[PDB]
Amino acid sequence: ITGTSTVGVGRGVLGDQKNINTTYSTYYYLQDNTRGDGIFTYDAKYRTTLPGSLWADADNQFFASYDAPAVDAHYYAGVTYDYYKNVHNRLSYDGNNAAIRSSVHYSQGYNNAFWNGSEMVYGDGDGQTFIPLSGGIDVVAHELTHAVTDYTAGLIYQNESGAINEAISDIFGTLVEFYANKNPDWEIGEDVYTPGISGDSLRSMSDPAKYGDPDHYSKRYTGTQDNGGVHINSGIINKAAYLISQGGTHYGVSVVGIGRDKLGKIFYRALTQYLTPTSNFSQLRAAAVQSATDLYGSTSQEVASVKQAFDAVGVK
Numbered sequence: 001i002t003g004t005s006t007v008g009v010g011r012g013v014l015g016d017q018k019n020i021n022t023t024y025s026t027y028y029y030l031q032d033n034t035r036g037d038g039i040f041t042y043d044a045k046y047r048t049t050l051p052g053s054l055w056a057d058a059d060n061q062f063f064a065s066y067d068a069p070a071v072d073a074h075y076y077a078g079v080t081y082d083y084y085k086n087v088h089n090r091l092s093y094d095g096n097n098a099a100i101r102s103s104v105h106y107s108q109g110y111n112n113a114f115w116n117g118s119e120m121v122y123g124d125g126d127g128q129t130f131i132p133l134s135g136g137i138d139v140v141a142h143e144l145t146h147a148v149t150d151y152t153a154g155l156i157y158q159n160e161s162g163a164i165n166e167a168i169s170d171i172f173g174t175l176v177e178f179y180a181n182k183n184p185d186w187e188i189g190e191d192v193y194t195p196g197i198s199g200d201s202l203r204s205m206s207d208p209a210k211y212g213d214p215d216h217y218s219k220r221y222t223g224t225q226d227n228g229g230v231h232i233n234s235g236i237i238n239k240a241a242y243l244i245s246q247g248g249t250h251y252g253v254s255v256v257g258i259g260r261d262k263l264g265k266i267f268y269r270a271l272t273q274y275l276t277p278t279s280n281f282s283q284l285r286a287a288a289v290q291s292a293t294d295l296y297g298s299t300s301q302e303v304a305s306v307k308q309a310f311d312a313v314g315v316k
């Protein structure tokens, strides 16, 4: 759409008010021209045909409940774009300012969110297991990072490589949640999962086993569902990433925490320079150690901690 850039205001899934970047051409659209080649949000109108209609509103106010998931998908995608640019100097997902697109209101009672190879897609949840998925900044950032990974390392979605792909999306989703300072934690999806129960989440990075996911290589799932356990075995890498950041003693192995910034710099470097489509856990460890080496020196404490953390989770 060609028009005039403006700013509208509305309310997100959790009922918080925010300003969002819109475009005006007869209607006001959810089109943000301030970021790269644009962020565009579409209505899939409960259907599965994509992308759907670019979102149009008559008065630049988005307070209807039907509007909530679109406000958030649009705003959170902006924040996520900002994180990548400000922290890692990367322009959008392909590093060349590609337009970021999302569709909300996909299907009926859809309890998931995903990246379809070209755009993000968000279900509204059935209202018991989930509420509209774009209300979780860690979820939106998990989705856009799959795009980042696909354009860089290209980790195949299965077995070990696939679990690394999933963990990268949880790690960066989590780093974005802290960047935005939105009540941050080391849990995934807490804000949109089981509105009826407080205190739970889909997965935990600080203690994966809390929901039955492995937290040590010896406990890796070796079966075939979930493409070989991509959302299960990610627990082992997420625990490693949590220890490199925060520190702790896990299975008798102590790790000194180096903090979140460094965690983010080391994994982004591993992802963008060293990993490949078929990389396995062991190769991820070599990548992470080399990245930390590049950045802080071989005899650094940073290198030391990346090593300790992998040892703690059993990855050699």
Ligand SMILES: Cc1cc2c3c(c1)[C@H](CC(C)C)NC(=O)[C@H](CC(C)C)NP(=O)([O-])C[C@H](CC2)O3
Pocket: 111, 112, 113, 114, 115, 133, 138, 139, 142, 143, 146, 166, 188, 189, 202, 226, 231
């Ligand atoms: C078993 C399975 C398969 C696929 C999934 C997911 C699980 C997982 C389902 C949710 C836990 C309910 N999806 C994800 O973890 C994320 C969404 C979270 C809310 C962050 N979606 P993905 O982008 O990983 C898409 C896949 C596809 C297949 O989700």
Ligand SMILES: [Ca+2]
Pocket: 057, 058, 059, 060, 061, 062, 063
């Ligand atoms: Ca309106």
Ligand SMILES: [Ca+2]
Pocket: 177, 182, 183, 184, 185, 190, 191
């Ligand atoms: Ca949180």
Ligand SMILES: [Ca+2]
Pocket: 138, 174, 177, 184, 185, 186, 187, 188, 189, 190
């Ligand atoms: Ca979280």
Ligand SMILES: [Ca+2]
Pocket: 190, 193, 194, 195, 196, 197, 198, 199, 200, 201
């Ligand atoms: Ca809950």
Ligand SMILES: [Zn+2]
Pocket: 142, 146, 166, 169
């Ligand atoms: Zn994922």
